Amino acid sequence: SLLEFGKMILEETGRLAIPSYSSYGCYCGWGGKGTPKDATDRCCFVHDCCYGNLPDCNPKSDRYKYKRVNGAIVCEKGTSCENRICECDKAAAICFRQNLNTYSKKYMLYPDFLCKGELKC
Amino acid sequence: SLLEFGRMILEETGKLAIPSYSSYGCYCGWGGKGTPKDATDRCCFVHDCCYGNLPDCNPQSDRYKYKRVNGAIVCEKGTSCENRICECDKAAAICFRQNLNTYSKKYMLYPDFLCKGELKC
Ligand SMILES: CC(C)CCCCCO
Numbered sequence: 001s002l003l004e005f006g007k008m009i010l011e012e013t014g015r016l017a018i019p020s021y022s023s024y025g026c027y028c029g030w031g032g033k034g035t036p037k038d039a040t041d042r043c044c045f046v047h048d049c050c051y052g053n054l055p056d057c058n059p060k061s062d063r064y065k066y067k068r069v070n071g072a073i074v075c076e077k078g079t080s081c082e083n084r085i086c087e088c089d090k091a092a093a094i095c096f097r098q099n100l101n102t103y104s105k106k107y108m109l110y111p112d113f114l115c116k117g118e119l120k121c
Numbered sequence: 122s123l124l125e126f127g128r129m130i131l132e133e134t135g136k137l138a139i140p141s142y143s144s145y146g147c148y149c150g151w152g153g154k155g156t157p158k159d160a161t162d163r164c165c166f167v168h169d170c171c172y173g174n175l176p177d178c179n180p181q182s183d184r185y186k187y188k189r190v191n192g193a194i195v196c197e198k199g200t201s202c203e204n205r206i207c208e209c210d211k212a213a214a215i216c217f218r219q220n221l222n223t224y225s226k227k228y229m230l231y232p233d234f235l236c237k238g239e240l241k242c
Pocket residue numbers: 002006017018021022027028029043044045047048049
């Protein structure tokens with residue numbers, strides 16, 4: 001669930017999921033339209049494409065457990081859903097960290113009319 | 122479109138396009154700088170050069186139709202675009218399987234950061 005996803009985000013990046021990654025670019029948030037604008041925006045694009053392969057589960061709320069092993073995120077075992085949802089989240093949070101370098105405030109509260117292509121997954 | 126591409130990849134490699142390939146090496150996923158890490162990575166590179174030679178088309182989005190005859194991918198006839206795109210995708214997918222034996226988890230979620238400079242495709 002987003003309660004776990006938000007925890008990984010704050011752990012890996014130090015920024016809170018809400019402002020920092022809830023209104024960033026064309027895909028970090030809920031609107032989802034156009035072409036990713038940067039490294040961080042693509043992490044977000046890939047992430048909900050990941051939630052896309054999980055029709056039989058509900059990512060927003062089923063909670064899973066994870067823990068670190070030698071500092072790395074590891075998804076504890078559980079139901080197939082809990083595990084796949086967690087992998088989607090794990091990767092995304094790591095992706096936000098590897099790109100903390102190009103994270104710019106110019107992409108926050110980005111306007112809808114600047115989100116461009118037709119892109120599906 | 123990514124829809125045809127992504128599942129072309131699972132038909133050939135057995136892996137789901139997203140985790141396995143969305144962020145592999147320096148050119149898998151989107152991304153575009155650096156000297157390709159390995160064979161798999163070289164395919165993403167070549168695939169990018171391929172999309173790059175279709176200025177008149179929208180590669181990431183146009184849906185094309187393809188069939189498998191006697192286990193081989195065959196691009197059905199459509200527009201000039203749908204056909205050239207399909208071939209780009211088929212070439213990448215097939216390459217992916219040819220190099221499955223060198224696929225290294227060591228490169229999934231690779232720091233785009235470590236990749237510097239633009240190779241002449
Ligand atoms: C859910 C908010 C807090 C951050 C979302 C990143 C979503 C990528 O689809």
